[PDB]
């Protein structure tokens, strides 16, 4: 079980998170500065979020020892994932948050019926209040219930550049980001970011309760602004490289705002339409949890 | 609660029948009679003698400090008939004589702990209330079947015949057959201990050892889930979209109001210039002559017999028209899954789903199409396409080691793709004596 | 004497393998390995060849044949004829031609009476042998080769499919492994003598 | 990798780098299409991207 | 994940209502997942480029 | 009759810049946009209740020119023709219909073509009997007018 | 008149059946209802219909 430790899942260390900065890797907090920021005469408001409608999919229990936490990392940021928005995995989830059900959350992220002995996991009540949030976004796609997206952006951006003037403040004028690279950094950074176990710091960011909240967030304000960053590339227009002395520099368009598809089909990851339907009524649930 | 505990059930006829005989078979003192006075002292004392941990019903009131040593020791009690329990033992302060309720299970009589008897096992009744019903003449069709099959000749089994009356048959319906000896009278006596030889004790009528040890092991091939392919009901509903694998269930939406079909709700009136077929809401009581416009519900037909052709239309006409779901539950069906490329080879129609004889059962196949390479970059777009009419909600998925083993790009699985599991590869170890055991685990 | 049962080379079993494959799904990679690499680990590749959609396991369609009534192309086990409507002609379809094939399957597996006899067998040598197929192999194979997951543990392209079978394989919970095996019942003389398999 | 000399190994690679990147979608040639023929005429089909 | 090349498989597609005046009857259809174009016989986009 | 909008419904204008092809699960489609909250919806279902009012077809891609009145038929989507001609007639109860306008060369067709329609009566019908078993099926109207 | 209990169209007379047959007065049957064995032969003799 591991029971839970008090000041998070994330304080363990048994699994943490580390950007391959090429030969050698590094902490998030390490890699944000590479990168600069360029005001343009543009600007968002932030906009308030409303609220998600609770009617979470019910209980089926096919027999599939779904890899829930698996596909969960995949669409937001694994390389072009097919058909990450259907049904039947979320469905056999919401059975998580019921008390009393014999139907544990692997360590791994690999849900299973009855039990193991040789595996240990997250104890029942750390994973009933996870889930009792994560299942909803199972059902993003419908006509009625989904979510928005060419709003939820103007936040992205204040924290990938925020700064604190402009976090403190309502709104900020368009960035244009610009880092050192390596030619094929962009997808490198997310072909890692995958195997980060996003299931441990997302079933602790609703089990943390009023002061080891406090700490947590002032504490991985990193690993949710990497992610975010990773995120916020496939959706941004235009990538324009710079060539100057002997270094080569990649240009990210606009951090703010949605251009609605492609990025870069070549120097990025893309997102398709069965994407935005998604990460969107993602961002709609962390965000909101989250501040 | 915890729909276990609290106090043990059974009809008088179950009793005789199972319990009797074969309790009778050692030398105890047959089961004390619950007193309409209390004795919680001697209840398992005159119960430790009979070994049978159950006691007989009679008259008047269990006692309070005896409704309590019933649900302690885990003591059954025998009721000619239960209309009701409440009077029976007066439960006087929690809740309990007639309101959370009872359930349903079986007992394979393991409270003999007493070896050679009780043979068989839970799975051989689930298969008998399986069965629908046999008659007479049925048993006796069977019978002849399965001897017939098998090369043994049966020239007169089961009827007596005399010179000067012909051919009179008897029937072949026995059940616990247990040969004992008649008394001049004609009356069945008893066991008749110490003569008798003692091999007319028991048996279940079978190749002692051989017969009863292969029965044993077979049985449990029979009740497993994976050979049982024959899923029940069908819900019919008109949403629109594209998944990936069969067994997709469609929740019923959000708001929805479920009436149970009527063969009443339906009524023919006067609209505009016309008769048409309406539609009456239970809820509200209102007309709604359109097959279209008429409120969204949950329909569930039981009956899909009686219904008129104009009935069935209605109903399959505001699935499409009005977003009904609707259900069945007659119609029996087995699925197998067909791979994303070729196709369909057999399509069915919705006018012929309302119209299928109760008993026989068609096949529908449903399409997998997990594994398919999605079109080029450059290629003409679509138009309103693809709308889906039958789901199952059995489900189906039921026999499946692996599946689709090929590799996404790159070093992933494919979403939503299996793999075998850890138990059809692990060859165990011989019993301390006799058959296969596991690893074991830790 | 009475000769109750008989005997034969191989057993069958009631429990067979099933697949539906995909001809637009092939690797361009022709893979090889040593001849006692394919021989133990050989069938068993080409049951499962790569871009296969379904492989699902169901009543074997050989040892319950038409020889005893059993009938099953649709994966139901049909009988044409055990419970009926008398008086009145059979129909073309029943539902209660399955639970009467449902009982006679349970006849046929009572009623059995079979030997298993080693025969044909052959034993590889260690040079000829890869590390990861060798200790699997206690000392003797059965002549002739057997289809099972986790003997195909590095014989597939398939990279994502390798892994589970490692890790299922690793964990002490499980142990696969075929060949002449270690036995309670052993020396035991009944005119010939007594072997695990 | 390989056994051709370090010259072609590296005239490969920098004739493969200026394909890979350099980049013209579907739209660029549908957007020199409107400069042959009278104003106004219209354009529909493949995906700009 | 990659593109076909060889032609794949269809329902196929099939024409229904287009006049003013229509009064169906929701008979047949099929149940399996089919496709319904309104306009008849479109896909019109014959310029290649090369 | 004319018919109007009935209740919660948003006027729209036209232009083939709102009308895009994209690709959603594992096929191309068009897709609409509803300029007022910048969406996607791509499928003729489940489209917000719009009252699109299209003043010229110049630019009318027949496919995209087609996939407005599928979506009038699965969203119950109200659209408008401004630079039609037309000389219809009133019809008695009998003799029914006979030519009718195809609800494909009324959205695809040149400028300048004046096409006639055929209108319904109906005040002399005669109405069903006492006693009878009703009969199904139910009658469509796609083309309204607006003068009147 | 009573074995049509839920087989006609006719919909005002088939709640007017399926109310005073399901009556707690009266009820219909049909077929075999019970059976006289035999004493010395132990066969079915005379049966009710």
């Known amino acids: 079980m591991l029971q839970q430790p008090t000041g998070g899942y994330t304080t363990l260390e048994q699994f943490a998170f580390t950007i391959r900065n090429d030969g050698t890797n590094a902490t998030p907090t390490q890699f944000l500065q590479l990168l600069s920021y360029e005001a343009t005469e543009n600007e968002l408001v932030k906009k308030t979020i409303p609220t998600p409608e609770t009617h979470l999919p019910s209980a089926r229990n096919v027999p599939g020892n779904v890899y829930i936490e698996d596909a969960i990392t995949q669409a937001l940021f694994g390389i072009s994932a097919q058909n990450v928005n259907a049904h039947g995995y979320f469905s056999r989830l919401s059975a998580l948050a019921l008390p009393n059900t014999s139907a544990r959350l692997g360590l791994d992220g690999v849900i299973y019926n009855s039990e193991t002995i040789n595996i240990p996991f997250y104890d029942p009540a750390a994973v009933a209040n996870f889930a009792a949030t994560y299942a909803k976004l199972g059902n993003a796609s419908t006509p009625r219930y989904r979510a928005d997206m060419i709003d939820i952006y103007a936040h992205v951006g204040l924290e990938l550049a925020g700064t604190d003037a402009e976090r403190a403040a309502g709104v900020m004028p368009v960035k244009r980001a610009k880092f050192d690279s390596w030619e094929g950094s962009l997808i490198s950074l997310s072909r890692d970011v995958v195997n980060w176990k996003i299931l441990a710091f997302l079933i602790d960011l609703c089990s943390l309760e009023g002061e080891a909240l406090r700490a947590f967030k002032t504490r991985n304000r990193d690993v949710f602004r990497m992610m975010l960053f990773i995120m916020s590339t496939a959706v941004a227009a235009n990538v324009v490289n710079r060539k100057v002395t002997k270094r080569v520099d990649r240009v990210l368009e606009y951090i703010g705002v949605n251009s609605m598809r492609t990025a870069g089909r070549t120097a990025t990851i893309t997102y398709d339409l069965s994407r935005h339907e998604f990460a969107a009524k993602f961002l709609q649930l962390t965000f909101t949890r989250w501040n | ?442 | 004497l009475s000769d109750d049962f008989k005997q034969i080379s191989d057993p069958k079993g009631y429990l067979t393998y099933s697949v539906k494959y995909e001809d637009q799904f092939t690797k361009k990679d022709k893979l090889r390995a040593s001849e006692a690499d394919d021989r133990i680990v050989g069938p068993t590749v080409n049951l499962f060849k790569y871009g296969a959609a379904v492989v699902n396991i169901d009543l074997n369609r050989d040892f319950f044949d038409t020889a005893t009534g059993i009938d099953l192309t649709k994966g139901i086990p049909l009988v044409q004829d055990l419970l009926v409507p008398i008086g009145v002609t059979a129909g073309a379809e029943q539902s209660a031609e399955y639970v009467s094939g449902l009982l006679m399957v349970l006849f046929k597996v009572m009623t059995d009476n079979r030997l298993v006899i080693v025969g044909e067998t052959t034993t590889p040598m260690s040079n000829t042998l890869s590390t990861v197929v060798n200790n699997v192999l206690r000392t003797t194979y059965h002549n002739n080769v057997g289809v099972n997951p986790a003997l195909l543990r590095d014989f597939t392209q398939v990279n994502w499919l390798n892994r589970d079978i490692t890790n299922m394989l690793q964990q002490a919970g499980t142990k696969y492994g075929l060949g002449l095996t270690e036995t309670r019942l052993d020396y035991v003389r009944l005119v010939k003598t007594i072997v695990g398999h | 990798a390989l056994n051709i000399d370090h010259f072609a190994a590296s005239v490969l690679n920098i004739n493969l780098r200026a394909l890979m990147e350099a980049n013209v979608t579907a739209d660029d040639r549908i957007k020199a299409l409107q400069a042959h023929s009278m104003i106004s005429t219209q354009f529909h089909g493949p995906n700009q991207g | 994940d990659d593109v076909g090349i060889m032609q794949q498989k269809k329902p196929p597609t099939v024409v229904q209502s287009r006049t003013d005046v229509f009064n169906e009857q929701f008979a047949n259809e099929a149940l399996h997942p089919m496709t319904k174009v309104i306009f008849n016989g479109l896909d019109v986009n014959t310029e290649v480029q090369p």
């Open chain 2, 1 to 442: 609660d915890d729909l276990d505990e609290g106090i043990r059930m059974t009809t008088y006829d179950q009793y005789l029948s199972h319990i009797r005989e074969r309790l009778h078979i050692t030398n105890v003192p047959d089961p004390i009679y619950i007193t309409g006075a209390s004795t919680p002292d001697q209840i398992a004392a005159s119960v430790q003698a009979t070994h049978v941990a159950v006691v007989l019903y009679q008259s008047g009131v269990i006692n309070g400090s005896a409704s309590t040593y019933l649900r302690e020791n885990e003591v059954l009690v025998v009721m000619p008939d239960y209309y009701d329990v409440v009077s029976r033992f007066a439960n006087a302060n929690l809740q309990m004589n007639n309101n959370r309720y009872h359930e349903s299970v079986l007992e394979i009589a393991d409270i003999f702990d007493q070896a050679d008897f009780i043979q068989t096992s839970d799975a051989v009744r689930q298969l008998r209330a399986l069965m629908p019903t046999l008659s007479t003449s049925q048993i006796r069709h069977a019978i002849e079947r399965i001897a017939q099959i098998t090369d043994v000749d049966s020239t007169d089994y089961g009827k007596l015949t005399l010179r000067f009356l012909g051919t009179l048959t008897r029937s072949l319906k026995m059940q616990n057959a247990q040969i004992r000896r008649i008394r001049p009278d004609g009356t069945v006596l008893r066991y008749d201990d110490q003569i008798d030889i003692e091999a007319f004790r028991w048996s279940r009528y079978f190749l002692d050892e051989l017969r009863l040890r292969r029965l044993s092991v077979g049985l449990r091939l029979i009740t497993n889930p994976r050979i049982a392919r024959r899923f029940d009901g069908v819900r019919i509903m008109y949403l629109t979209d594209d998944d990936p694998d069969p067994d997709f269930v469609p929740d019923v939406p959000e708001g929805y109001v479920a009436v149970q079909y009527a063969h009443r709700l339906f009524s023919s009136s006067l609209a505009n210039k016309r008769n048409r077929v309406t539609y009456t809401h239970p809820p509200t009581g209102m007309a709604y002559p359109s097959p279209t416009g008429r409120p969204h519900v949950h329909m569930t037909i039981n009956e899909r017999a009686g219904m008129s052709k104009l009935v069935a239309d209605n109903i399959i006409a505001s699935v499409i028209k009005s977003n009904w779901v609707v259900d069945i539950h007659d119609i029996e069906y087995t699925a197998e899954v067909m791979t994303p490329s070729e196709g369909y080879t057999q399509h069915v129609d919705a006018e012929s789903i309302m119209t299928a004889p109760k008993g026989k059962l068609f096949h529908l196949q449903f399409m997998d199409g997990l594994l398919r390479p999605e079109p080029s970059a450059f290629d003409p777009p679509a138009s309103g396409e693809d709308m889906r009419l039958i789901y199952p909600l059995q489900p189906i998925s039921v026999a499946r080691s692996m599946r689709a083993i090929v590799n996404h790009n790159e070093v992933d699985r494919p979403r939503g793709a299996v793999a075998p599991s850890s138990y059809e590869m692990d060859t165990g170890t011989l019993s301390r004596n006799g058959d296969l055991l596991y690893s074991p685990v830790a």
